[PDB]
């Protein structure tokens with residue numbers, strides 16, 4: 520068994536904690552969605568390789584510029600997270616999160632993850648985003664951002680419907696097992 | 699952790715912990731608020747458990763079996779005793795408040811109405827000053843501990859066998875030396891998110907809403923002071939490297 524470490528970064532409204540919880544839990548938070556995530560060590564078997572994957576969160580650290588980088592040491596893969604129903608969280612990827620992850624973690628694979636993709640066909644999301652001259656993040660805008668920031672790959676998921684969540688974490692395990 | 703408390707916090711939520719007949723008598727907003735209060739205590743119980751693993755299992759275990767320099771163990775687990783005292787006292791205060799609120803003839807049914815007052819005490823005055831300085835020292839010595847752990851594991855075979863041995867149980871999956879160290883640093887930043895979500899369902903009592911508003915401001919002031927006083931240490935950082 521090989522031990523690899525994951526870390527999820529991104530603005531709060533991207534849904535990073537939910538993503539970690541819905542993955543780590545065999546169930547679905549039907550009764551209670553926890554406010555916080557401690558840590559989890561997932562047993563993953565990707566492409567025949569069996570890896571132990573420590574999952575970590577940076578939610579709460581967003582305003583503490585010296586406390587936040589203490590999560591980064593020894594990270595093998597980075598999940599760079601943004602919300603599809605939030606174009607503002609995508610714009611902060613190359614301005615805020617990319618400069619910092621590349622500073623502390625040069626050469627560590629980054630996977631751009633577009634969360635809340637189920638909200639791309641939601642009408643409450645279109646109605647409120649029209650009030651700010653905005654509209655849900657288009658697939659090509661996510662792919663082009665992943666390209667522009669030099670991401671290892673670009674993925675999309677929905678932690679509410681569990682759609683594409685197992686794939687993101689199986690791919691992050693491949694990314695962490697590189698070179 | 700003690701069996702009594704483990705069984706008291708074994709459920710996923712406060713709604714699953716209390717008896718279904720007791721839950722039925724409460725409103726939506728109350729069940730909501732109590733689920734998040736239950737989480738604040740559940741995670742605090744877990745936090746203290748993490749510091750017990752570090753002190754009794756690793757720190758003490760090393761002192762007794764691995765006969766290495768005493769400053770090595772201090773370098774590995776800095777301020778763990780001080781940290782354990784802060785959180786064991788907070789946990790006791792939180793656990794007593796739950797016990798007081800227990801309905802007569804029941805060990806599981808309760809409703810905590812007052813919490814903001816206990817949080818204002820924790821994050822203000824000497825308790826806040828002792829917490830700020832301890833987390834500043836822990837966090838600034840965090841990296842130096844991760845490097846010292848790796849130096850020892852990848853240079854000493856006795857240290858390697860000890861670690862492999864003490865971490866062998868299934869219950870230590872999330873709790874290796876480094877994961878315990880990150881779990882501790884990440885704890886202080888969980889409080890504002892927990893307190894804001896509790897505050898979101900505490901509008902039924904105006905003095906409770908103001909308590910949780912003040913407590914929120916106090917954790918945030920504390921977090922800013924720890925963050926401002928952090929300067930990473932390096933194992934053998936030369937004097938020239940420090941003053942430049």
Ligand SMILES: NS(=O)(=O)c1ccc2ncsc2c1
Nearest residue numbers: 591592593594595623624627
């Ligand atoms: N500069 S740092 O302490 O944040 C750090 C150290 C090692 C490492 N290895 C992989 S990601 C990473 C980050």
